[PDB]
């Protein structure tokens, strides 16, 4: 019946930059308008790892097929796609130039470039993460690993002895609460000390470059720091990982507060991949300070260049950069963008809702729900100390969530509401 729109055009009326969240919006943007518009999508990476199930994945509760998804799947068939990153953006002309060089015009622009991982911020990190034996671990799997490599699942298991370091980069970074696995490791490593699998002379410290774990929610961060001390874990703030030596297992840390760098032997190193601001967004005069998009906190519309929007992680929003937060940010963009093409007003406001689970134990978790003002809902930090209630919620997220991201990309299942 309907024919697939053309991709070999000079300009469009809507343009999405991103496939993880920029694809879910496009697929949602068409069904809301019934395909009255021709929209183009342009991502950079071919694969989208489901970081929302990263911890169940490290527990091998989620197979590699249910954790690895291609970017094409998120985008529908009607809308064309091309894996070329934007080389520059000219809001004054309402156009976008790609790496190849083909100028493309637009009427409304949606940016979902999020936070780009930069392994080069830490010398020798990627080369040690790719080694199938070295005890250096990270938050995502490199693209060189095949289906037979399961090094990701050996961070907690293969910690027989030595000094362990869980490093957190400088904010802004991706995976604030959905990649914190220092509560499950403690429970698993508490058993190893009981029957001798883990040497008694070991050291585990959390190297947090930032001053607080959760920046836009004081209730959650206060709970974390409260629980970390109750467990007996040590932390070091203002310190960020700088270099990793794969030969002698040396980790170079630096205290940004004092500027004093040190070298520490490691035997099990985990780090959340650090992000990096993209210059093409700063050269166009769109980001503000840190490098995030300067957009409205309610409508997500950019301050200047009203024809441009922004959501996901690249947006500067006083909230936790989660995925469920994206579910409420795509429903707003598809609404406002629908109103800009019709000249109508923008009646869609984003409340700042964000929902991400915090794994408090090997098989227990609690949801970190909070709005813009850090105010939590009925689910905020409930059944946190374990129990039958937290046990069931854990199984619902590990054994029943990865099977849902297939529909989200297909379109069979939309957001929560």
């Amino acid at each position: 019946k309907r024919k697939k729109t053309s991709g070999d055009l000079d300009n469009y009326d809507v343009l999405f930059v991103g496939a993880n969240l920029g694809g879910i919006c496009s697929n949602h943007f068409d069904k809301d308008t019934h395909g009255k518009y021709k929209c183009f999508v342009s991502f950079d990476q071919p694969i989208n790892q489901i970081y929302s199930v990263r911890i169940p994945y490290e527990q091998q509760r989620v197979r590699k097929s249910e954790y690895i998804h291609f970017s094409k799947k998120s985008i529908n068939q009607f809308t064309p796609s091309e894996m070329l990153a934007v080389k520059e953006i000219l809001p004054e002309q309402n156009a976008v130039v790609l790496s190849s060089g083909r100028r493309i015009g637009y009427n409304q622009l949606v940016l979902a470039t999020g936070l780009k991982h930069d392994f080069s911020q830490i010398k020798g990190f990627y080369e040690a993460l790719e080694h199938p034996e070295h005890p250096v671990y990270a938050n995502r799997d490199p693209e060189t690993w095949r289906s037979a490599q399961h090094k990701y699942s050996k961070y907690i298991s293969n910690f027989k002895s030595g000094d362990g370091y869980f490093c957190i980069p400088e904010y802004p970074y991706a995976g604030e609460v959905e990649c914190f696995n220092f509560f499950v490791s403690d429970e698993v490593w508490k058993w190893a000390q009981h029957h001798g699998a883990l040497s008694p002379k070991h050291t585990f410290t959390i190297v947090n470059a930032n001053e607080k774990f959760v920046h836009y929610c004081d209730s959650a961060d206060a709970f974390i720091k409260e629980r970390l001390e109750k467990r007996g874990i040590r932390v070091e703030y203002n310190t960020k990982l700088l270099e990793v030596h794969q030969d002698g297992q040396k980790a170079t840390f630096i205290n940004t507060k004092t500027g004093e760098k040190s070298v520490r032997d490691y035997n099990n190193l985990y780090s959340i991949v650090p992000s990096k601001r993209q210059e093409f967004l700063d050269k166009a005069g769109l980001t503000n300070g840190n490098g995030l998009l300067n957009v409205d906190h309610q409508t997500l519309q950019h301050k200047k260049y009203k024809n441009i929007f922004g959501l996901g992680d690249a947006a500067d929003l006083p909230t936790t950069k989660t995925f469920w937060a994206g579910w409420y940010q795509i429903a707003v963009v598809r609404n406002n963008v629908k109103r800009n093409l019709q000249g109508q007003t923008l009646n869609a406001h984003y409340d700042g809702f964000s929902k991400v689970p915090l794994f408090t134990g090997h098989q227990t978790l609690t949801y970190v729900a909070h709005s813009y003002g850090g105010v939590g809902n009925w689910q905020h930090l409930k059944h946190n100390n374990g129990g039958i209630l937290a046990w069931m919620r854990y199984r619902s997220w590990a054994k029943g969530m990865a099977k849902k991201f297939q529909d989200f990309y297909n379109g069979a299942r939309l957001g929560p509401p």
Binding site: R146, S147, A148
Partner: protein, 75 residues
């Protein structure tokens, strides 16, 4: 009562029907995996993975049937 009870255990037996088709369905899947391998054995790991995956989906139905069985046997 006993009549409805007789049908309950009777349905419980019917669950062995997919078990039969699951056996036949497995032979066909692996028979193709063999032929698919002799054609181009360069993709052992690939074809092999795709094989077991499909088989896993089959056991889903098999377990689903048995689950339906005990359920209807007591509900």
């Amino acid at each position: 009562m006993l009549l409805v009870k007789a049908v309950k255990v009777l349905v419980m037996g019917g669950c062995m029907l997919p078990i039969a088709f699951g056996a036949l369905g497995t032979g066909v899947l692996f028979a193709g995996f063999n032929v698919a391998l002799s054609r181009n054995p360069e993709e052992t790991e690939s074809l092999f993975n795709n094989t077991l995956m499909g088989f896993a989906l089959i056991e889903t139905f098999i377990f689903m049937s048995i689950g339906l069985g005990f359920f209807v046997l007591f509900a």
